[PDB]
């Protein structure tokens, strides 16, 4: 009675740990592979999306190589900020720069 029960339960549970994990992982990679390299066309969960590189990491790598650069100096990408925000942002930053050169905080802006 106890021997036949232990065989059937191990048969039911342990069978899906090997091939079903690799088959679903391959189908997960295949949808991401069909999605190309730099455009997530397959709508995967956030946890599955990341997928780290793996390897030993090149040891020599100087500071200059490490950053990902679209245009030599740095990565450059398009932005869609309403201009009023940018103009508003820009002025505040300038005052701080002048203030250090001025060396005066000039209090806080008020009503």
């Amino acid at each position: 009675e106890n021997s036949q029960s232990p065989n059937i339960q191990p048969l039911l549970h342990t069978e899906n740990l090997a091939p079903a994990v690799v088959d679903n992982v391959k189908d997960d990679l295949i949808v991401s592979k069909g999605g190309n390299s730099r455009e997530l066309a397959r709508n995967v969960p956030v946890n599955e999306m990341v997928q780290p590189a793996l390897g030993p990491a090149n040891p020599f790598v100087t500071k200059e190589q490490d950053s990902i650069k679209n245009s030599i100096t740095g990565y450059a990408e398009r932005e869609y900020v309403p201009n009023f925000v940018f103009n508003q942002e820009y002025y505040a930053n300038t005052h701080a720069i002048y203030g250090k050169r001025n060396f005066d905080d000039n209090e806080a802006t008020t009503s």
């Binding site: 994990v21 992982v25 793996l54 090149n58 020599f60």
Partner: protein
């Protein structure tokens, strides 16, 4: 304690496997080589005077799985270290994340001792691993001509 033969587009590589030390690491590798899993795969990383990693079915960098399921635990011993030029060892993405990927050192690497699971050393084809490890590359350390694995034989 069985060997394996790799046929590439440059030359043949024979490798001993320390299965006595690492049973699972030489269970995974040996099974995939025989099945026809490493067939037609590129050595996607090549670094002059460091390594030439492989074992990428997807051909991406973030690919490959084990015979167990997805990833398995490392098995480190102090007997096996990276002192030499031509040492088979498994690549990983942390402590317990070994996929199919392995690599072959071209010089001594003390700093990789304790992280990666070593599981073999190259007997014959040491001229192929030096010649393969001096191929033109892109800035993303990828070879300009894809150095394929033609056949994996299990001896």
């Amino acid at each position: 304690m069985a060997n394996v033969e790799l046929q590439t587009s440059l030359g043949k590589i024979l490798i001993e496997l320390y299965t006595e030390h690492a049973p699972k690491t030489c269970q995974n590798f040996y099974t995939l080589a025989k099945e026809g899993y490493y067939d037609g795969v590129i050595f996607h990383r090549v670094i002059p005077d460091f390594v030439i990693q492989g074992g990428d079915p997807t051909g991406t960098g973030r690919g490959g799985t084990s015979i167990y399921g997805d990833k398995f635990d490392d098995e480190i011993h102090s007997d096996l270290h990276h002192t030499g030029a031509g040492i088979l060892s498994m690549a990983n993405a942390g402590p317990n994340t070994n996929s199919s990927q392995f690599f072959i050192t071209l010089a001594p690497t003390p700093w990789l001792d304790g992280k990666h699971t070593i599981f073999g050393r190259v007997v014959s084809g040491l001229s192929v691993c030096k010649r393969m490890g001096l191929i033109r590359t892109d800035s993303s350390d990828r070879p300009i001509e894809p150095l394929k694995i033609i056949k994996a034989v299990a001896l």
